[PDB]
Amino acid sequence: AALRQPQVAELLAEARRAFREEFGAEPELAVSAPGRVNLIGEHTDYNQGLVLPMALELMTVLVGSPRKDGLVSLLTTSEGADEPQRLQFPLPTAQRSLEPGTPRWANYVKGVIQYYPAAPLPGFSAVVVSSVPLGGGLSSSASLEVATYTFLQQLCPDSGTIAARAQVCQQAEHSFAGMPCGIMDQFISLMGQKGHALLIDCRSLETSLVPLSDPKLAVLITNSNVRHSLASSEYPVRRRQCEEVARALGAASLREVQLEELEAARDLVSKEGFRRARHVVGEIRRTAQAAAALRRGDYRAFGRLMVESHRSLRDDYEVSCPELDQLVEAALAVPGVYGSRMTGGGFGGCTVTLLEASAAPHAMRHIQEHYGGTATFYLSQAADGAKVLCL
Amino acid sequence: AALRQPQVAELLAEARRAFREEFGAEPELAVSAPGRVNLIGEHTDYNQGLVLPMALELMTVLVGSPRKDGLVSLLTTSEGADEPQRLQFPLPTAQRSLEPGTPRWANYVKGVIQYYPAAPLPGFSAVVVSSVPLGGGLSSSASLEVATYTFLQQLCPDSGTIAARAQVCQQAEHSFAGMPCGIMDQFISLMGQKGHALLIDCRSLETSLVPLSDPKLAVLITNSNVRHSLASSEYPVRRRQCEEVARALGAASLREVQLEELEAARDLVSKEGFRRARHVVGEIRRTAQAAAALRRGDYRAFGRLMVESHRSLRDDYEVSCPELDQLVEAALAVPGVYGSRMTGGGFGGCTVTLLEASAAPHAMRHIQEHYGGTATFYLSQAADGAKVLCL
Numbered sequence A, B: 001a002a003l004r005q006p007q008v009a010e011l012l013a014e015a016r017r018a019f020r021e022e023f024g025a026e027p028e029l030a031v032s033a034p035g036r037v038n039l040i041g042e043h044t045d046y047n048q049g050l051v052l053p054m055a056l057e058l059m060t061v062l063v064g065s066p067r068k069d070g071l072v073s074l075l076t077t078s079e080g081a082d083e084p085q086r087l088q089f090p091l092p093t094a095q096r097s098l099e100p101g102t103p104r105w106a107n108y109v110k111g112v113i114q115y116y117p118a119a120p121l122p123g124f125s126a127v128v129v130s131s132v133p134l135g136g137g138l139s140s141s142a143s144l145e146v147a148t149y150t151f152l153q154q155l156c157p158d159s160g161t162i163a164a165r166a167q168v169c170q171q172a173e174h175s176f177a178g179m180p181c182g183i184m185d186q187f188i189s190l191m192g193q194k195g196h197a198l199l200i201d202c203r204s205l206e207t208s209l210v211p212l213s214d215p216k217l218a219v220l221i222t223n224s225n226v227r228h229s230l231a232s233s234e235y236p237v238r239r240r241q242c243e244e245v246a247r248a249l250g251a252a253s254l255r256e257v258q259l260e261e262l263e264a265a266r267d268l269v270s271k272e273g274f275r276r277a278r279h280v281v282g283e284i285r286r287t288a289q290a291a292a293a294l295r296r297g298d299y300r301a302f303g304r305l306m307v308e309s310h311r312s313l314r315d316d317y318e319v320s321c322p323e324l325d326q327l328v329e330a331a332l333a334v335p336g337v338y339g340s341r342m343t344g345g346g347f348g349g350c351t352v353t354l355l356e357a358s359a360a361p362h363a364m365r366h367i368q369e370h371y372g373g374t375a376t377f378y379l380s381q382a383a384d385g386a387k388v389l390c391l
């Protein structure tokens, strides 16, 4: 036991049956959207940098039907969601716009509806099921937004691009969820392809598909199953810290600041500010190197870069915690572990570990043994992004 | 005027309609797969080179229904498909494979059925309609193959990779149409994204999606209305002349040969084979430079590299015709045109012209006046790849 990862046909069946019960008929329409692990390139997306995430086999499925009455009627089967697990509300009009409210889980859906670029949208009934753990740092939020977006497309086709949909999901997260994320989670949930990671250039929005499918390789995800109080909190503080440092250096973003320019201008910025820029500018470089390493088959080089990334996030960006540090220190101790680090926004959530497929069983036993807390594990391949399911 | 480009809703309705008439019921399943234009990197894909295609709004729509009796029943509405435009034939069995026969157009479907990797596959009825001009160098052939494959996936899920679907369609084109194509046409049909070009590395099969986000940049396609059939052309001879040069220099392919190496090895190959290989080696270098130019907005550079592509295809590879030559010279005389070149296999078909959007109307009048024949015109955006359409 690593945690089981239901396949789509299973999640679809569970969603259909829960809808049949709730609404009294079979649903007409279905879609899926994955969760996400970031292999490397943390706190770079809102700095116009480089990220290398892959989509997981963990996913949100959303089934539903149009209505003729202009209503939205929702049910989520996730415990983890704040109560009530059901909500109904009328579609926004040019006269009354939707509003963030409680239950907080519905905000993600209301936000996507509120910014959906096409019209006219009918009402709908829908059930959500998820295998993404809510609030585990594997991006259940972007899964839900992108599932919601893809579903609305089945009611009312858009005329825009992948990146425009990601930006609609991003704005919904900003205005309705109150969380000023970059573009990474929405982008990988939309753009994943199985047996690949995605080098996303968050400035050009150019994407490269980097093969990550060798039977002698595994990616292991360790849920710390913790979430400290600085999550809601220091993420916006860091994002503001980065924008200052860029202004002080005459730079549109930290993407335009070369690592050698930064060293030779510490005196223009706080000692705290300097350590933040150093992380971001180095991580961008590490992410470019790591992508080339992963294509080459150089797991050792990739693993070193993962660890260098962890040290940087721990000491220079200070978004690690004791629990993530502990879980990374246990992982590197295991023979066959190429590297390990804190993934997502941090202050808790998950570590990602790259290792020999043969060592995963040992690696899971050693990390459980050497972690105070109760840890959960996913052995996860690179998955496809958001799909329509024909019913 | 640009020739208008039917949207999917309209191709779908012409397909529902011809399906109802032919088979006396509504179809249950639908798919689309686009044609493509190659921006630069011609006759490199089978030499393990680089190409930069985008998918088109021109597409093949296939609608159909599982059958009970283990037969395949097909209709196409394309004028230009050899008679008969309808046929039935039994599914391949373990006892006996499909074989290429008459009519030539159905070899593309038979081949994809023969090589489709998942079982069991039921009989089916299907109609094919297309906005892709048959024989025009916009890959009507790969559009047909990939539409068929995406359809079979609706009858019987596969569980390989996007890449293995393209190599099935390629396999079908080699063995059933006897046309030894590279992987480009099938890959772009599968992998397209609207508002992107696709840089394909045909050695490693790595892909980048390059944003075409600029409303002041147009792509104009000019059909010469001289038809190629690539099978019976000098295409297989070019491919073999490239192979004999690689073999002579001890290279796995011409991707492994630099210009300077080819130049010192003249005494190893014929005058002709040297010229063919010099086009290929040159064209690989130019496609990398072109991607770099496009990435920084240097359209004048991109256009000069396209003109060099065209002179290399005309003089060293010898796959142009007097008609493509006149269409290119005529587009180059127009202000706001960055570059123009033949696209696809050659011997006829289409040119591709990159130009200021505002110049498109002048450019269409000028090329038509200065063309000895009758040109048709598509003003083209980057389009989505192959898709399921839920009925």
Ligand SMILES: Nc1ncnc2c1ncn2[C@@H]1O[C@H](COP(=O)(O)OP(=O)(O)O)[C@@H](O)[C@H]1O
Pocket: A060, A076, A077, A078, A080, A081, A082, A104, A105, A106, A108, A128, A129, A130, A133, A134, A135, A136, A137, A138, A139, A140, A141, A142, A144
């Ligand atoms: N399937 C779901 N059903 C209901 N709410 C969900 C679902 N998936 C995500 N959510 C919402 O998203 C929140 C988790 O997002 P967040 O705190 O950003 O963590 P993460 O994105 O890492 O999982 C939940 O608290 C809930 O409000």
Ligand SMILES: Nc1ncnc2c1ncn2[C@@H]1O[C@H](COP(=O)(O)OP(=O)(O)O)[C@@H](O)[C@H]1O
Pocket: B060, B076, B077, B078, B081, B104, B105, B106, B108, B128, B129, B130, B133, B134, B135, B136, B137, B138, B139, B140, B141, B142, B144, B228, B229, B230, B231, B344
């Ligand atoms: N929709 C269609 N219906 C029937 N045949 C088709 C269709 N699309 C493509 N074809 C077949 O593909 C052939 C064209 O292939 P080819 O000569 O390689 O040209 P292209 O560059 O258009 O792909 C036609 O001769 C016909 O056999």
Ligand SMILES: OC[C@H]1O[C@H](O)[C@H](O)[C@@H](O)[C@H]1O
Pocket: A038, A041, A042, A043, A044, A045, A046, A181, A182, A183, A184, A185, A344, A345, A346
């Ligand atoms: O890599 C840091 C990461 O953090 C969170 O997961 C956000 O959702 C992303 O947008 C990104 O900033």
Ligand SMILES: OC[C@H]1O[C@H](O)[C@H](O)[C@@H](O)[C@H]1O
Pocket: B038, B041, B042, B043, B044, B045, B046, B139, B181, B182, B183, B184, B185, B344, B345, B346
């Ligand atoms: O670039 C030339 C081009 O010609 C045809 O369209 C083939 O299908 C492609 O594979 C490629 O070889």
Ligand SMILES: [Mg+2]
Pocket: A139, A140, A141, A142, A181, A185
């Ligand atoms: Mg989140």
Ligand SMILES: [Mg+2]
Pocket: B139, B140, B141, B142, B185, B230
């Ligand atoms: Mg063809």
Ligand code: NA
Pocket: A367, A368, A369, A370, A371, A372, A373, A374, A375
């Ligand atoms: Na433990």
Ligand code: NA
Pocket: B368, B369, B370, B371, B372, B373, B374, B375
């Ligand atoms: Na003319």
